[PDB]
Amino acid sequence: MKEECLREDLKFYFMSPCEKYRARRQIPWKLGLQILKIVMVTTQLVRFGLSNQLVVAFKEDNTVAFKHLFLKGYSGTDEDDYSCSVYTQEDAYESIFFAINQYHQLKDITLGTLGYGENEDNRIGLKVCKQHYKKLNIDNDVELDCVQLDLQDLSKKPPDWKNSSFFRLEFYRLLQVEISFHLKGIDLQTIHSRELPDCYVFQNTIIFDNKAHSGKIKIYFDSDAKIEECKDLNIFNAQYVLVFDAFVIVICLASLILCTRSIVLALRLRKRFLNFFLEKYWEFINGWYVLVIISDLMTIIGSILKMEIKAKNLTNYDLCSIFLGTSTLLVWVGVIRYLGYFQAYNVLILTMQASLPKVLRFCACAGMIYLGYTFCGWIVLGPYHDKFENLNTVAECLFSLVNGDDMFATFAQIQQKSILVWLFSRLYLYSFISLFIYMILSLFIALITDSYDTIKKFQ
Amino acid sequence: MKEECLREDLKFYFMSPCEKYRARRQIPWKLGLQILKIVMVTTQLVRFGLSNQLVVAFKEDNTVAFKHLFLKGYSGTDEDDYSCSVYTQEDAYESIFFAINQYHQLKDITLGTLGYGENEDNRIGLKVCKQHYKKLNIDNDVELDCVQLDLQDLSKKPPDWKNSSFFRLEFYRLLQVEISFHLKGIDLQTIHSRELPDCYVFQNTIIFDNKAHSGKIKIYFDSDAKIEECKDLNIFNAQYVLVFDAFVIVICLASLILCTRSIVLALRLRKRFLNFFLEKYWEFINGWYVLVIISDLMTIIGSILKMEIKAKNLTNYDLCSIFLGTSTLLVWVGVIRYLGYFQAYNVLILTMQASLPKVLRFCACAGMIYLGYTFCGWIVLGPYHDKFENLNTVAECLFSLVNGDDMFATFAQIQQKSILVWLFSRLYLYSFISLFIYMILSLFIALITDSYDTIKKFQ
Amino acid sequence: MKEECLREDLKFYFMSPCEKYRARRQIPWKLGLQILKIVMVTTQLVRFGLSNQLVVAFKEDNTVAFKHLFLKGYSGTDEDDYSCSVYTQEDAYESIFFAINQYHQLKDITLGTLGYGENEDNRIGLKVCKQHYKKLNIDNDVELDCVQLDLQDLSKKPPDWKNSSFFRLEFYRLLQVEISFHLKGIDLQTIHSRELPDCYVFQNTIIFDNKAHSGKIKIYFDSDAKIEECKDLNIFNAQYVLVFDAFVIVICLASLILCTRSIVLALRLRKRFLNFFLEKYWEFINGWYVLVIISDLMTIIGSILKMEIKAKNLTNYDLCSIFLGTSTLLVWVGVIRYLGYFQAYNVLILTMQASLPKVLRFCACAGMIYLGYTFCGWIVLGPYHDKFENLNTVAECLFSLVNGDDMFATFAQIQQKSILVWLFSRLYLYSFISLFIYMILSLFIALITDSYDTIKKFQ
Amino acid sequence: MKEECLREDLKFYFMSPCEKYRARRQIPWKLGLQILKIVMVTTQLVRFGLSNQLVVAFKEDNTVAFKHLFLKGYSGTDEDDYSCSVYTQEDAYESIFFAINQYHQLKDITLGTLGYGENEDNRIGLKVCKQHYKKLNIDNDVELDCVQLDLQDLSKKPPDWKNSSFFRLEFYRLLQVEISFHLKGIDLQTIHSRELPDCYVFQNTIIFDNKAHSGKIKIYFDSDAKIEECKDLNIFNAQYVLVFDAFVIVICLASLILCTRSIVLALRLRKRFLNFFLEKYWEFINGWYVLVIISDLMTIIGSILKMEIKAKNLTNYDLCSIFLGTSTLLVWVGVIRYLGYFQAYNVLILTMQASLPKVLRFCACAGMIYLGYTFCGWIVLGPYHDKFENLNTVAECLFSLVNGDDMFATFAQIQQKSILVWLFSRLYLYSFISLFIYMILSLFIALITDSYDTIKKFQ
């Protein structure tokens, strides 16, 4: 009778929860735990995204306002990673003095709720640091000399800091000049909800950088905002988000227990069948449960990081987002296993998974041509094409070219002053596009004439 | 003999109007009613579009002129949903005073036929409203205080409104300042047709908005134009368009009667055949007639809305256009049924409609991956990529990426200051593009090796 | 013996010139006439293109210089079909007076070889014309009043034209103000070849246009350049190009005779075979010769027009180019018949021409959906999308969308202030792209499963 | 026994190095020489690219700084191949005088480490050369007259060079004005590595060019930088790169010997088999070795050029890069032969190489249509479309259009003032896109229905 019982076991282990009900009126409480998971995880992700949008928008808007306030002649768009640049000694002096003077008159210039903030030394003021190579008989060591400009120093009607010997810069040895100050703001765009607003501290540094010593000073504006508590303020949910994140951890933990239970019990059924087969003489793994386990672990980790961020009021959510997003993605891929319970969501799998070896072998072959073209393009067209500046950019450009993106712009971007490089670029681009189109279309006719045989043999 | 008669019925019910003439010299007056419909509906749509183009062009040109007249330092292009922005208290004051002074001197500045218009209170003048949080000890309530600047007030050679206590703004509590005025224009670009021109009333509001309190005031210019009747004017078709719209309603109503008649009579023939089949023991629906009925209803509704708009001289035609366009689209799809009467416009239908279940099943599976990628991309790359700002934008970006659009720009838009987010973005984009290309090409080889069998079985 | 002779005829009429030599050592002097044609026609086209490039470049460079000289605050790029625009009465006055003053001081401002040219009335000077509606009690008639500003009038140290009653404009009735003057230039960039340079006459008109009466004056600069003969000039091939064009006409005329001879003689062989077939009881046309005849006619016409243009020194070559280009295109298509003489350049024709009926039938069906979408998109998204402004633009946008071009930009271009139009635009774009991708891929699986059968039956 | 020995020979000559070990425990020291080659060649290329990036970045940054210092009103972006342009005599004078005055005050304007450099005549100063047509009674000869402006000449408090008769230019005869000067810089961005920095000499020429005589002067800034040795400098690997390049030459020379040895020995085995076949009565070439030999030759040549460049301190690496890149590309293609030793990386070759004749025949046919369209588009749309300016640009535009790139932009770029050219452009673009899409999809259905038969016959 043990053979019949074993056969009934697997006959029950291989059917969908919808059917298992038909066979035994059983309730898949585990499938329910999964629907409640998809709803709770998606809800948490959306709420987290909305709150992050609000905070990030406030910080970025304040940064743009600061750039307009303190950078002289700021266009409104960052030239590069740096905001603006100067090419003349008098331009650099004007930018430095403009930043200092705008800080002096902040209360009459700012449109928002800004005030001066105490520095790390507990004093309202401005710090300017400059670095020079010590001394063309320059040395290799750098000299760092700074002074602290208090509000009393700036407020003197005859300004003495402008005429001081500090601000003679000797630009041929100058490495950089750095201006640091702190500002305190408030977002009143939160009081219309009877919730006390969040006071912010801004640590702004302006760096006038000429490490390159190429005749251009690059001006970087960096604003680091952190959420302090409000001290001087009188007008007229923390546990809620935390309980929700704790429930999410409970559901994704319960799912983690159940899936690991099923995998362990699946290994037990293998023994019985394997031992039974021995006497007379990955399918059991169900690698969707691997995906579910990974997504549960990632959701638990991301929820813990989110709780930690909310608890201590921290504003960088990059790694918390990378866990929650990559776990929600896997949750929706797990919806496909449930969808992949009706027989109709199959039959094309006999090609979608069977072609995978052929495609992966093709990728290995085409990968070597792709690497060779990447190296060639970087070395040759690097100094003449902005899409070939570095190896990673070359790889992205070649990937996009394989997909038809910006071909004419790619051809036209390279100037014709160097005739040899122009001819080589033409040959390079034409050969790459033609060769890869040919290879992709070939791979493909083959994949077809193979499936044809595969499906013929299957029937 | 009833069997023969029934057989002759269906033998007549299944043939084209061109053939039914061969079988009985009958005139398909109903097919004629359809050609006259396609011509009348298309003609009405084109005439409506041309007239709307004229009116909208006049209104938009006047709005651009107003923005140049009243917005200080207007570039010519709206920065965003708002036209321009300021970052300094003195800039905001300059913009406000510039708007007021330009309104004061309108007659000497405008190039067109503009004049002052009476307000809702029947008085030529300018209204300025400002909103402040009541009182950092601010309250949660807002205070709205306004004054009306008449032309006599502005025309005083010593201006007293500039120095009044109204225009001290206390920007840290300011929510917005709003300027409202009315102008009356004429389009003389209609007199060259001996048709009396249309006098317009413009309700212009300039909103200096800093609800965000982020250090930037956004300046919105909104112009609401309505067509009044001309009062002061002496120089040297309404029924026509209305009769045409009424004829359109008659033709699309007659077609509605005939199609509903045929469907009802089609149900009668089903009874006869079904009862006949019972004794010895959607095709009849002709779902093209469903399309014709829907298009007729939409055309009647759109024509009624068009008549209502023309009757009371109203200038917003968004919903009238959405009915007429979506009905003309369905009319041209109904041309395909007539085209689909020759046998040659078939045979490919045996795949165009048979593949539909497989494609729809594929869309269900790929839809879950698409949703997962949408959520992941929004949560991770949202704060760093302008094409991932919100969920709808992420969905559009992913759809476009599946079609090869702006891949290199999408890769390059994300800055590399955050290395973790940069690496994740690279992995995300590469995986999405590769996976979806693989899935689409797979779906496809399958659809082929299936049709092959389907067409083989058919023959 | 007549049967054998007839059979030998066709056996000779159906072989390639290369083979006919193998069968009879015959020289295809006619195939030679064709190679000399491809070389002579291509050479003529290239020479014509180079000379046109030179002339057009000179004229366009002079036009750009004129725009910088006479248009106040010209950016360097035309805003639209018009060069620049103004929105204030004082701006319009400044532009008009700037143009007049720059003309007054031309000799000291121009960098090239420019001088004043006599007008149609044989007098060096400037003409200003203005148009007003006669007289709000305006009439429907226009009044045209002008004055001629001579160089003596402009050179008076107290300028009287500025203060004259002519230049009070009454902008509310103004239609346009037009400034006309003539300049004479020389291209010294032709003397370095010992060829006397070409003196030009420029007829420049500046139109300050406000027909719209929308508060914007559009400023058009139109320069009409014609090649006069040089009068005042002393420094230190016309028959050649003409003889070459005459030889081209001879070769394309000889080819026209021979092809028409062969077609006529081909009809003779049809009679013999057709009569022979009758006794016991397009292939002969060779529609490549139709292409050759059309290309010969077009080349002769284009060469005649080119000779006419060169003879009387005229500078508009639009229709001459459209004949020469479209004839050279057909000449290269005729190279394919010669290439299509080896057997290997066939066998794929059994699908390239057999699929044509199925594709054309598909285009008829998809054409109706394309027209419906064009009308719907124009009527709905016309006032909100710059790619849907008019019907032709909508058709081009839909064609490009079918090919994957600017999808994200097309989605993003439409603003979200109108929620109904935004939702409809999303539905419209998604449905169009999905439907047309589906239809194209379907047409295609069908074309395959058909060729498969076609090629199977062929063997 | 010689038959058995011969059979054993080939049985050994046709197996992979991995297997030959299974058959004889032999060590493929030659395959090792290949892995060490791929690592050494890639390493050399990467190091060369990084060093070139540094040098080129320094030179380009200095050039941008020079353009900002010496070009009046420089925007920051080159208008074209030329940096900026002027259209007025006074603008040209201002630009010339601005360049001279900025050179005079260089020490107080430059941000980097710049100084005056001696000219070719060993004297610090500025040279201005102007060219005029000799003398409208101009001649054909040019007159070149120049003066040398020393620092003493520029430093005189009353400037005499401004008022000299040299700088009256007579613009109607002017060909160009050229300003030449030398500057000496240092990159201190190399001292932070205890490596003495590289002093540079810059040969800057500013050319005010109006060869066109079209009313625009084009201003070219050309900076030629060469690495001199440092003379005045006191602060606080050449053999390494050279030994590495010499080792690379040894490995790519040893590989060249071995591959040529194998090819020669391969020809010996052909004799034995061919003679053996005679008695009773490219595969042997292994054209991968041709690729290896070519890549070895290119690597040796590129390494020699790199050694020559490093030895004499020269900064143009265009041809050295074109050899190293195109050799590294071939090295990665040679990785595919090793990958193509497992049987699985085959079977698709039976189509990837068999389709090549059909595709090449298709390219020959489609090439003639492509050439015809190129000529037609250039001749017609050349003067109206910036993507059709010259034949090469037309070819690139058509290639991109075949791949779906910028279709709507291509359609929209051509203005509608000329209706005939607009209609022809529409017809041209539509016909090209439709025809080439049709031909590519046809080629393709054929390639499939052929492989099907090919693979069927193979089995």
Ligand SMILES: COc1ccccc1N1CCN([C@H]2CCCC[C@@H]2NS(=O)(=O)c2ccccc2)CC1
């Ligand atoms: C071996 O690569 C191919 C693979 C598959 C088909 C064709 C090619 N050929 C044809 C040309 N190249 C194609 C690359 C991708 C699409 C654009 C080009 N097709 S084209 O416009 O019709 C054309 C044809 C002949 C001459 C000039 C242009 C690449 C080589």
Ligand SMILES: COc1ccccc1N1CCN([C@H]2CCCC[C@@H]2NS(=O)(=O)c2ccccc2)CC1
């Ligand atoms: C499983 O997805 C695929 C599905 C079908 C074909 C290929 C792939 N592979 C190949 C690479 N990816 C392709 C995505 C769409 C087109 C661009 C890429 N083709 S490629 O340039 O020739 C290439 C090949 C190897 C390495 C690097 C680049 C995605 C994975």
Ligand SMILES: COc1ccccc1N1CCN([C@H]2CCCC[C@@H]2NS(=O)(=O)c2ccccc2)CC1
């Ligand atoms: C009936 O049209 C189709 C025809 C052929 C294949 C697929 C579709 N479907 C699938 C979606 N649409 C495709 C249109 C062209 C390519 C982009 C879309 N493919 S997708 O990114 O993979 C995707 C899949 C599911 C949901 C969301 C996105 C259109 C409908």
Ligand SMILES: COc1ccccc1N1CCN([C@H]2CCCC[C@@H]2NS(=O)(=O)c2ccccc2)CC1
């Ligand atoms: C003989 O060329 C073809 C080859 C293969 C398929 C179709 C065509 N046809 C169809 C139209 N043209 C297609 C070219 C490439 C893709 C865009 C066009 N397809 S479409 O949007 O669906 C369409 C259909 C009918 C009318 C209007 C538009 C080119 C001719």
